[PDB]
């Protein structure tokens, strides 16, 4: 019944929070790949929803990480936008986390269907706030129209975080981790 639906939503809110708490750690990559993975360092740009790769990838003032995922074509993209500047120290083993201001993800291939529509873009504008931040997640729907996750009926809202968003957050945290470990 609706009790189980409520518990499921809470577990999913916490799962996206725990991974966002790990994703905020990828600041360690600014002073710093697994196959088919390409990382760019850059800055939040344009309208604030997209990440612009730096001319100087190693620059100390980069505040966004842009990660592209390929397979057999581009399958996925993530942009981690961080609040705050980086530590002056050039050694990445000493760098600390920065709460994310935003997480922007794109799905190009291996698209998931939520009630038969593709959410190709997900825009999280409060990734390190209260786990229950569905009103901060914009969904761009293709059959791309803007919907807010908090206005999604619920199963639907649960399927969104279970099938699309948590998994992408986890996939990218793992890829950023592999890159870090390989160069650290």
């Amino acid at each position: 019944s609706g009790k189980s639906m409520a518990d499921t939503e809470k577990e999913l809110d916490d799962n996206i929070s725990e991974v966002n708490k790990r994703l905020r750690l990828h600041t360690v990559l600014f002073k710093m790949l697994p196959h088919k993975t390409v990382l760019y360092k850059g800055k939040p740009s344009a309208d604030g929803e997209r990440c612009e790769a730096a001319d100087k990838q190693e620059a100390q003032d980069n505040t966004c990480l842009h990660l592209e995922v390929f397979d057999f074509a581009k399958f996925k993209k993530m942009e981690l936008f961080f609040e705050g500047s980086n530590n002056a120290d050039p050694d990445p083993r000493k760098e600390q986390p920065r709460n994310l201001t935003k997480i922007r993800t794109y799905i190009y291939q291996n698209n998931f269907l939520l009630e038969d529509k593709v959410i190709s873009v997900i825009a999280d504008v409060a990734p390190n706030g209260e786990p229950a931040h569905n009103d901060k997640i914009e969904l761009f729907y293709q059959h791309v129209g803007k919907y807010i996750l908090s206005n999604v009926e619920n199963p639907i809202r649960n399927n969104f975080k279970k099938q699309f968003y948590f998994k992408n957050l986890d996939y990218f945290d793992k890829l950023f981790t592999k890159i870090f470990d390989y160069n650290d």
């Binding site: 577990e11 199963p155 981790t177 470990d181």
Partner: protein, 237 residues
């Protein structure tokens, strides 16, 4: 320890307990909780799925009692034609063969019951009912007992599709024993390819999956950027 290290230590011990070989205290706790969940769920197919799961676990518990009694009765026999070392070892090997064959039959009966528990859960078609914590708890318990029944008899390749279905359910992917068993079963399959001189694609497939679940089990129990995590990553890289 930090709040995360204390939490992790507590959770690994609870997970090791969760995968503990069955006994009477665990049986009692498990089924009293499942029956309370069944009353909350109020779904006839879940009730039937539980009735079959419990029958399967009962088969396992009945066998454990049989094995002790059988070995006892054999130990108490006088062996007049046991003058030579080879006679003693032969008789021991015959005992072990009878025990293993009876355990194999108990496993087959227990898995027929687990299969029936799954077939009844399959009849819950409403997606709001399949997402029930009660549904996920029972389904996890059925797969866990199924994995263990096969594991005990060294039927490791057979445990892979069930471990994989298990980890897809309700954050079971964050369980250290689940990844330990997957890694061990994948290791067995890798060794089978090396011993039988099988294809390279399967050698690397099984080796890859062993290393993924080896590293993930390590990450889960010891933590990211732990001496142990760094070690396994450096061996793989």
């Amino acid at each position: 320890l930090t709040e995360d290290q204390k939490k992790k230590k507590k959770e690994i011990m609870e997970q090791e307990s969760l995968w503990k070989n069955p006994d009477f205290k665990g049986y009692n706790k498990t089924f009293q909780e499942l029956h309370q969940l069944s009353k909350t769920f109020a779904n006839n197919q879940f009730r039937l799925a539980l009735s079959n799961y419990q029958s399967g676990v009962n088969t396992i518990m009945k066998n454990r009692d049989w094995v002790e009694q059988y070995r006892k009765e054999e130990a108490e026999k006088k062996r007049l034609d046991e003058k030579w070392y080879w006679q003693k070892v032969d008789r021991k090997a015959r005992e072990e063969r009878v025990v293993y064959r009876e355990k194999m039959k108990a496993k087959q009966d227990a898995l027929n019951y687990f299969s029936k528990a799954i077939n009844h859960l399959d009849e819950i078609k409403n997606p709001d009912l399949r997402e029930r914590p009660e549904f996920k708890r029972l389904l996890s318990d059925v797969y866990r007992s199924w994995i263990m029944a096969e594991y005990d008899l060294q039927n490791l390749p057979q445990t892979i599709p069930i471990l994989e279905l298990y980890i897809e359910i309700d954050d079971n992917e964050k369980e250290y024993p689940a990844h330990k068993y997957l890694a061990s079963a994948y290791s067995f399959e890798e060794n089978m390819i090396k011993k039988t001189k099988g294809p390279d694609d399967m050698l690397f497939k099984y080796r890859y999956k062993k290393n993924v679940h080896l590293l993930r089990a390590t990450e889960l129990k010891y933590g990211k950027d732990s001496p142990e995590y760094k070690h396994i990553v450096n061996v793989i890289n």
